[PDB]
Amino acid sequence: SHRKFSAPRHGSLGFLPRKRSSRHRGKVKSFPKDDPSKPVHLTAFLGYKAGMTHIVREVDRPGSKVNKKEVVEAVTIVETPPMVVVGIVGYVETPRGLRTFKTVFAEHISDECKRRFYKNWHKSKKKAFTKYCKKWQDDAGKRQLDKDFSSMKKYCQVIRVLAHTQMRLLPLRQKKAHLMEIQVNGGTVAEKLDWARERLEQQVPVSQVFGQDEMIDVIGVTKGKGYKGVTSRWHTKKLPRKTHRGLRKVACIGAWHPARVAFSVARAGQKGYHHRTEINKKIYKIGQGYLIKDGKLIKNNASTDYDLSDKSINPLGGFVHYGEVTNDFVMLKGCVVGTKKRVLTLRKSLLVQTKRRALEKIDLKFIDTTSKFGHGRFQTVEEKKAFMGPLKKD
Amino acid sequence: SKRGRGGSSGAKFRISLGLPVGAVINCADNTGAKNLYIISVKGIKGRLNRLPAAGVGDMVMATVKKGKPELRKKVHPAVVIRQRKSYRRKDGVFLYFEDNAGVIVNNKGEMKGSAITGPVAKECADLWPRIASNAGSIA
RNA sequence: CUGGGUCGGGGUUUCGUACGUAGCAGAGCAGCUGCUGCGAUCUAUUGAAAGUCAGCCCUCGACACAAGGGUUUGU
RNA sequence: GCGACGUCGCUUUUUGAUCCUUCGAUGUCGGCUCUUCCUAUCAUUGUGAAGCAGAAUUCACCAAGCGUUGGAUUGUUCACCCACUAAUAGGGAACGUGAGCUGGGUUUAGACCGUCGUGAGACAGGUUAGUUUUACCCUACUGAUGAUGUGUUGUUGCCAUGGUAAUCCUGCUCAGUACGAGAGGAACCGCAGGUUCAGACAUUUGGUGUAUGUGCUUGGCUGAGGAGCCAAUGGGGCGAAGCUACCAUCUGUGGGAUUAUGACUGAACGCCUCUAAGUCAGAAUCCCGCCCAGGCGGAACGAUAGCGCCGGAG
RNA sequence: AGGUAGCCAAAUGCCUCGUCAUCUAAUUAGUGACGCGCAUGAAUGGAUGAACGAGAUUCCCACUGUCCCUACCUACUAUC
RNA sequence: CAAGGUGAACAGCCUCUGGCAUGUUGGAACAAUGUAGGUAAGGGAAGUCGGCAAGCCGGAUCCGUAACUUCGGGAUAAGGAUUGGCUCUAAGGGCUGGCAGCCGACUUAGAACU
RNA sequence: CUCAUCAGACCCCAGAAAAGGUGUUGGUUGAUAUAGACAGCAGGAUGGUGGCCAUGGAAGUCGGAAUCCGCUAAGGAGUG
RNA sequence: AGAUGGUGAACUAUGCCUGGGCAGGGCGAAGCCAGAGGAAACUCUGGUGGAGGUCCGUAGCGGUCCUGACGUGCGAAUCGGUCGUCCGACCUGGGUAUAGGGGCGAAAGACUAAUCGAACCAUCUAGUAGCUGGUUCCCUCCAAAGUUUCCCUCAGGAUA
RNA sequence: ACCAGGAUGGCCUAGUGGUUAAGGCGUUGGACUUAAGAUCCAAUGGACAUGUGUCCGCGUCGGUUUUCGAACCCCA
Numbered sequence A: 001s002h003r004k005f006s007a008p009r010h011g012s013l014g015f016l017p018r019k020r021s022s023r024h025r026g027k028v029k030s031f032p033k034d035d036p037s038k039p040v041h042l043t044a045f046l047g048y049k050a051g052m053t054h055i056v057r058e059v060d061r062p063g064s065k066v067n068k069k070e071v072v073e074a075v076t077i078v079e080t081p082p083m084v085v086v087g088i089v090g091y092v093e094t095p096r097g098l099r100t101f102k103t104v105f106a107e108h109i110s111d112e113c114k115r116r117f118y119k120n121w122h123k124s125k126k127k128a129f130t131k132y133c134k135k136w137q138d139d140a141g142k143r144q145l146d147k148d149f150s151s152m153k154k155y156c157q158v159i160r161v162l163a164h165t166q167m168r169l170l171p172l173r174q175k176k177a178h179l180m181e182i183q184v185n186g187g188t189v190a191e192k193l194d195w196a197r198e199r200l201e202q203q204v205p206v207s208q209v210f211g212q213d214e215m216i217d218v219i220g221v222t223k224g225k226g227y228k229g230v231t232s233r234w235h236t237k238k239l240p241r242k243t244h245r246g247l248r249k250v251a252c253i254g255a256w257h258p259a260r261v262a263f264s265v266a267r268a269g270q271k272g273y274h275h276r277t278e279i280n281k282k283i284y285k286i287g288q289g290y291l292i293k294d295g296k297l298i299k300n301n302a303s304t305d306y307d308l309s310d311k312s313i314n315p316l317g318g319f320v321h322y323g324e325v326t327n328d329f330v331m332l333k334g335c336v337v338g339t340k341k342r343v344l345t346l347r348k349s350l351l352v353q354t355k356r357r358a359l360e361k362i363d364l365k366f367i368d369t370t371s372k373f374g375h376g377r378f379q380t381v382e383e384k385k386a387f388m389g390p391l392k393k394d
Numbered sequence B: 001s002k003r004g005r006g007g008s009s010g011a012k013f014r015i016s017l018g019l020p021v022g023a024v025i026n027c028a029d030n031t032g033a034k035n036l037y038i039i040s041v042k043g044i045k046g047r048l049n050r051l052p053a054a055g056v057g058d059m060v061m062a063t064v065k066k067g068k069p070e071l072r073k074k075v076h077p078a079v080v081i082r083q084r085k086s087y088r089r090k091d092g093v094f095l096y097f098e099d100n101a102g103v104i105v106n107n108k109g110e111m112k113g114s115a116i117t118g119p120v121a122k123e124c125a126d127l128w129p130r131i132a133s134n135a136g137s138i139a
Numbered sequence C: 001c002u003g004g005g006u007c008g009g010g011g012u013u014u015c016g017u018a019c020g021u022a023g024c025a026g027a028g029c030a031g032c033u034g035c036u037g038c039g040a041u042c043u044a045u046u047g048a049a050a051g052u053c054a055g056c057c058c059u060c061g062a063c064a065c066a067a068g069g070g071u072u073u074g075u
Numbered sequence D: 001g002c003g004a005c006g007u008c009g010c011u012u013u014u015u016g017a018u019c020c021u022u023c024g025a026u027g028u029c030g031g032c033u034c035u036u037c038c039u040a041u042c043a044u045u046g047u048g049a050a051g052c053a054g055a056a057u058u059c060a061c062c063a064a065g066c067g068u069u070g071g072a073u074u075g076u077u078c079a080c081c082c083a084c085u086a087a088u089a090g091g092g093a094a095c096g097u098g099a100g101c102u103g104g105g106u107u108u109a110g111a112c113c114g115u116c117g118u119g120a121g122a123c124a125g126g127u128u129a130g131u132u133u134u135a136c137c138c139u140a141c142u143g144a145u146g147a148u149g150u151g152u153u154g155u156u157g158c159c160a161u162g163g164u165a166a167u168c169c170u171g172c173u174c175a176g177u178a179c180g181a182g183a184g185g186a187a188c189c190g191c192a193g194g195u196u197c198a199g200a201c202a203u204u205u206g207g208u209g210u211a212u213g214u215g216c217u218u219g220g221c222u223g224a225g226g227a228g229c230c231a232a233u234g235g236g237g238c239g240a241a242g243c244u245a246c247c248a249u250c251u252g253u254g255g256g257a258u259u260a261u262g263a264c265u266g267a268a269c270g271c272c273u274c275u276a277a278g279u280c281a282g283a284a285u286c287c288c289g290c291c292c293a294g295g296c297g298g299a300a301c302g303a304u305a306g307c308g309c310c311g312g313a314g
Numbered sequence E: 001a002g003g004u005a006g007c008c009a010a011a012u013g014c015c016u017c018g019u020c021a022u023c024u025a026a027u028u029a030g031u032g033a034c035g036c037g038c039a040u041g042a043a044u045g046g047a048u049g050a051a052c053g054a055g056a057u058u059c060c061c062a063c064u065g066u067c068c069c070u071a072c073c074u075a076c077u078a079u080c
Numbered sequence F: 001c002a003a004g005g006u007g008a009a010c011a012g013c014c015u016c017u018g019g020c021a022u023g024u025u026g027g028a029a030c031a032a033u034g035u036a037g038g039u040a041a042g043g044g045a046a047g048u049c050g051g052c053a054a055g056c057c058g059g060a061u062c063c064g065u066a067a068c069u070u071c072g073g074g075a076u077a078a079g080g081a082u083u084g085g086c087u088c089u090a091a092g093g094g095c096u097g098g099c100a101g102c103c104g105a106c107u108u109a110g111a112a113c114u
Numbered sequence G: 001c002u003c004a005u006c007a008g009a010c011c012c013c014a015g016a017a018a019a020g021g022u023g024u025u026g027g028u029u030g031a032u033a034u035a036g037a038c039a040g041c042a043g044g045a046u047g048g049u050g051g052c053c054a055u056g057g058a059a060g061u062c063g064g065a066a067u068c069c070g071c072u073a074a075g076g077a078g079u080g
Numbered sequence H: 001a002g003a004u005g006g007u008g009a010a011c012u013a014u015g016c017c018u019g020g021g022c023a024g025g026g027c028g029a030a031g032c033c034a035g036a037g038g039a040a041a042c043u044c045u046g047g048u049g050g051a052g053g054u055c056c057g058u059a060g061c062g063g064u065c066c067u068g069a070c071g072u073g074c075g076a077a078u079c080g081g082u083c084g085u086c087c088g089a090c091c092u093g094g095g096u097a098u099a100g101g102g103g104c105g106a107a108a109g110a111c112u113a114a115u116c117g118a119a120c121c122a123u124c125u126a127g128u129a130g131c132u133g134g135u136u137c138c139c140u141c142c143a144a145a146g147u148u149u150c151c152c153u154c155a156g157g158a159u160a
Numbered sequence I: 001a002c003c004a005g006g007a008u009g010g011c012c013u014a015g016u017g018g019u020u021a022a023g024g025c026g027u028u029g030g031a032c033u034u035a036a037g038a039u040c041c042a043a044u045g046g047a048c049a050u051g052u053g054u055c056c057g058c059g060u061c062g063g064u065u066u067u068c069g070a071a072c073c074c075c076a
C-alpha cells in the first residue's frame, strides 16, 4: 500500500558509493574544456587547508538590502606554496577513450617528489630516476627526448603537466610531496608543449594560475568520521523513545517483493572521507608569503587598505591544529571540505560566469586574526599588550 | 511569506526561527490581548513532521488566550516583532530579546492597536511599515 | 652538522586574584594598663595562582636517541 | 462543457462469487519509519480548445522529473473541521513494512451493565485490566581487507560500465500598463530573496564537556593550616580543544536528439493540405555532460636484488 | 401488574459522531442539560454523597528532548 | 549483638572495629547499535491512543489556606517569604550557705557583619 | 498484402470490443463523362419583381404562405 | 479418557498451639488543668493528654508502572528505579489438623511439592482408534477403480 | 434477506365447521333541560386489502400479489 503523506527521500543517490576514498589527494575528474584561442595557462593547483577566519566587507549589490552595507563572511585559508613542475604527460584521443601517450620527466627531481615514488624512504637507497637522469646528460639521450616531444606534438591532443608541492615550506609533519597532473589549456599542442618544456624544473605560484575575485572549484576528501549509523550518515528520523531494539535505525528497509534489499535504502557504514567537488568558491584574497626584504621580515598579509596594520593571516597562537601560513595563500569564501592540513585541489571553473555574485568585486576591510583556540578577543599581540599593560611576566 | 502590495525592493534574509506552532508570545500592543497563541505561520509549505515556525517579521495566525473576551475564540493575523532565539544579521551580529512578542494585524498589514510596547526588530520594521510607525524603539 | 622524541621555555587560551606575609581594615567579643589575642570577611602582594596537547603554535635551550631488525619478491 | 433512452469495454485501490495452495502454523487492524513503482495529472514545465476580453476557471495532449504539509476529535482505514499552501491527486509493492517498533482496537483466562436464556451461559452491544521470544547461518544490502593478470613493485593516469539532483515559491520592475464600459487586472526579460532537498563545514552564535581545566560549596575523612581525597562523574558556575545544529555558515551547473504542439516546401487529388518523399522550432520528459565509484579492462613512466639483453644441444 | 420515586445517549441508547449549551482556532473526546429510554429503574437495590483509591476518563497551571531536531559527554559492552 | 559525624532518624553519605579483593578471566582501543546515567539554545505536549518516560515540587521556620463535608476532615489544600558563614545578645536550670557562692547542659529567639 | 512515434508472428494458449480512419489494397451498386466531363483559372447572375401577405420599412436578401414565364447558353421569384 | 489400590499439607490454602518482631516523624479523639465570660444552661481561650483497622515513611510484607532490563537469562518468574502498606482483618519460625470427586478457599476455579475445570505412583494395559506416519531382495507375466444398491451411511463398510 | 404472522364499519377489536356480518366508542334523528354534557328511545354504515382455486355457496380453507408489525442475521 502507498505511504500517506509524501516525504522526500533522505540523501542523494548521486554520491551513492558512500565508501572511504581510494585517493587521499582530490583528483580532477574533468578539467576545463580547452580553447585554442586562449593564452596558454594552467587550470588547476594544489593547496592545503590551513583554517578559517571571518572578514568584513561592504557589498555592492544593487537591488539587495545589503547594498553599500558591511557583512561578516566566513572564509577559509588554503596555504598554497608554489608548485614545482617535474614532468610532461601527453594524451591521445582514441575510440576507447583518452590514452596516456608519453611521459617525460625533468633532469632534476627533488627529494620531496622522489619520496612519492616510495612507500618507505628510510630503508630505500633512494634510486628512482638515477638511470633516467642519464638521458639529459647524453647527446643521444637528448636526441631521443626531443623526438619524444616531436611525437607528443604530432600525436597528442591533451597535454598535462606533472607538478609536485613544496613540502619543506609547510609546517606539516609530512615531507613527502604530492604529485599531480594539471591540464595545460591554451593554444596549439606545439606551443602548449613548448610552454611546459620551458616551465620544466621551475616553480609556479598561485598568482599565475588563479586571480582575485574568481570562482574556482574545490576538490578534496571529506573529514573522516568512521563507521556511522543511519541517523548521522543519512539523517533519517529517530524512532520514538519506546522502541525496543534501538531507536537510531531505519524501521523498514524494504517491502516483501522486491525480495532483496534495494541499493536506495539507508544503511550504516562509513561516513566522511568522501571525495567531493564543490563548485563556485569565490577567491576573496590571494595573499603573498613571508618576504625577506631589506633584512626586514615583511609579513603584513592581513593588512588591508582599511586596516593599516602589520598583521599576518595567522591568528593568535597560529592556526589551531595546523601551524603557520608563511607562504602565499588563497582566501576562499565559506567552507571547503576536509580537515586542517588536508590537501585541496583548486580547479578553474567548468562554467561560464555571467552572474552578479560571480562577477562581484571584493574589497576586504577587516580580517579577523583573533585566536581560534578559545574566545580570543585581540587581533594582534601589540593590541593585547596595549590593553593590558605590563603583567607579572616582566 | 508577506505577499503584500506594499513591498520594498529588497527581500528579507533568512533568520533563525524560534517560534513554532503552539508558541504563546506576548501581545505587545494596546488591543487588550495579552497573549498570542500561534496556530500557523504564513508562507510555509513545510515538510513531514516539521512544525511551521516563525521569526521576527513573519506573519502568523494567532488566537488570544488571555485578554478581552471579544478578542478570544477566533483567529487573527499577527506579526512577530521580538524573539528569544538569537538570529544572525548580515553584519554577522547576533541579536535576541528576552521575550517573544507580536502584534495583531489584518490581511493588508495594519495593526488593530495603535501603539507598541517594547522594541521592534529591524527585520520586522522594514518589512511592515505600519508596525514601524507605531514602534517606539527599533531593533 | 642533520632529524624527530622527551623535558624546559615562550605564544595562545581557560578560570578568576593562589599559599605565605602585612594591614589603626573588619560586625563584635575577651584579657591586660594604649597593648595583646579570637574573629567570617576585606585590602595589597596578585589580571595572581593553576592548567594548556595528549589530535593547539613557535623554539634551535637541555638530554639521550637516530647510520638498525625480520620476511618475501626475477621479465 | 454536458448528455437521457440504449449499447461496448477496461481495471482489480470496493464488496461479492468460488474453494485451487497453505490447518506437524505464511504472526491476524491501525499508526510510526523507510525505499521504490504505476498513472486514471492536484500542482509545476511545454502545449491545444473553450459560451478563453484581462484575471480566474474548465476540457484535452506529451508528461510521474519534482512536490503534495501543521493540527482538534476518533484505535481507526474512512470521515469532518481549523490553518497554511504551488497543490494540499489517487493508488500498488503478501490489502508493502510486528526476529522494525507500538499495542490504542479486535480476539483467551478477571470483572460490570443492558437484552436473551429456568440454568450453565450467549451477544459484528457497550465498559475496564490484561507476558509482543530468537539471527552468531545463507543470500540481499551497506561499508571493510583482498583475490586473477601485466615478471615484481611503485608513481601518475584513462574510462568501459553502474549510480546521478535539484526543486518550487515570494517581493521589486514591467504596471495600475496591455485587456476591460467600468469593476477589476496580467505576462516575457531582468533584480533581490526564500521554501523543500542535496553536499559540506565550524570563522562566528548555540549546544556538549570527566582537558575531572579553574573557581565555589555540602556531608565526611587525612590532628590543624596548606594540600587533597570519598559520596558508583558529590553538587553547582564558567569552560580550551574536538565533535556538532537551517539553532551558525558555504555551494548547488551545460548541451543534443526530440514528445505534445505549432509550422515550411509539397504531391497524392491540375485546387488544397504540417506528411506521403523532404525540412524547421520544440519542453520539470529522455540521453549525455557536471558529479560519485572505478572491469578477472587497458596505458605511460620509475627502479629492479644473481638477474636482463645478445651469439649449442636435449 | 402494565415501570411509581428517581436517573439517563450513564460502565446501561441501536439509530448515533442524537439535539442544544459549554470547553477549542478546529473536539466522533469532556461536562451540563433534553428524553421518544433498540433494551434505565428501586435490597435482581434506586438516587445521593464527605473521606479514601499504584482504579477509568476530561480540562487548566507549572514543568520539561515527548516533539520541531537532533547533538555531545560518561560507564559497561559490542570490536581486536 | 549493632561505634563516630551529619541528620527527626536503625534514612542516605563518609569513617573507626572487624572483613574483603570487585563477585566463573586479563590486555588494547574508544566504530555503530545497544543497556544504565547526564546536559541541551528557541518553543513548551505541536509528540502520542494517552504527558508513557523524564522533568517541576520536596526538609524545616514564619505566615496563609477554598468549594465541599457524614462537621471528624479536606489540609503539607492552593499561595507566599526565609534558610549560608561569622561575631554577639537575651531567655529557658541545678547545688551549698526575693541574697551570695559554686557549677552545668542543650535549645529557642532577636541583632550586626559578611 | 502490409510500416506500426503500441507493428506482426501458428489449435489448447495465455490478453481485447462497440465505434471510427480522403492510411493503403481490393470489390459491389448507382450517376456523369470524347453529343468532351471533374477540379483549377475567368465571364455572365436577366426582366415580370422594388411580389401579394406580416413587419415602421424587408425591395430574392429578418420570417410564413407563391414558387410561374420569356428572350434563353442561362439565372431559384434566389444558396450566403 | 475410564477403573482399582496406594503416597503426599518440606510449597501453598485455612483453623488451632507455642515463640519472635515492627526506626523516626505528622495530624491530634476522649479525659484533665487554668484563665475569661454568663442568671443559669453552659460557652470562648490557652495548655495538657496520646486515641485511631489515622497519615508521611525505615525494616519487614507486597509487587503499580516503565508494557524498562533479561528473554539459548543470574533466574523453568529474576533485576533496577518508581511504587502499595508498615499497630492491625500485621509479618514470621517451629509444632499440629484437614487428602483427591476429597481438602481448603476475604471466591481468582485459586491453592493442594515447578503438576489442578479433579494431584502424584503403580497396575488393569500392548485399553480402543472408520484417523495420521511407516512397512526391508531381484527379474518375469497379467493388470484396475473412484461407478450400482443398502447402511446413524457422507474421511467407513457390505454388495454388484 | 429467511421463518412466522396481521390486514373487516369513521377509530379500536370480534367472527368457525361453510350459510349467521358482531360489540364498544363514534355519527344521525327524537325525548329530558332554559341550554349543553350525563341519561332515555331509536337508525345507518362495512371495496370483509386484491384477484384466483375448492365448494352448491367463502370474510372464513388453499396457493400468488399489495401495505404493516414481530423474532433472527452467529464463529472468526
Ligand SMILES: [Mg+2]
Pocket: A002, A003, A004, A006
Ligand atoms: Mg502519494
Ligand SMILES: [Mg+2]
Pocket: A242, A243, A244
Ligand atoms: Mg518496549
Ligand SMILES: [Mg+2]
Pocket: A372, A373, A374
Ligand atoms: Mg575555537
Ligand SMILES: [Mg+2]
Pocket: B048, B049
Ligand atoms: Mg507527524
Ligand SMILES: [Mg+2]
Pocket: none
Ligand atoms: Mg508449513
Ligand SMILES: [Mg+2]
Pocket: none
Ligand atoms: Mg513461522
Ligand SMILES: [Mg+2]
Pocket: D026
Ligand atoms: Mg515470515
Ligand SMILES: [Mg+2]
Pocket: none
Ligand atoms: Mg496519459
Ligand SMILES: [Mg+2]
Pocket: none
Ligand atoms: Mg499487510
Ligand SMILES: [Mg+2]
Pocket: none
Ligand atoms: Mg517481517
Ligand SMILES: [Mg+2]
Pocket: D098, D132
Ligand atoms: Mg514481534
Ligand SMILES: [Mg+2]
Pocket: none
Ligand atoms: Mg488493549
Ligand SMILES: [Mg+2]
Pocket: none
Ligand atoms: Mg476477557
Ligand SMILES: [Mg+2]
Pocket: none
Ligand atoms: Mg562478533
Ligand SMILES: [Mg+2]
Pocket: none
Ligand atoms: Mg554514465
Ligand SMILES: [Mg+2]
Pocket: none
Ligand atoms: Mg481605457
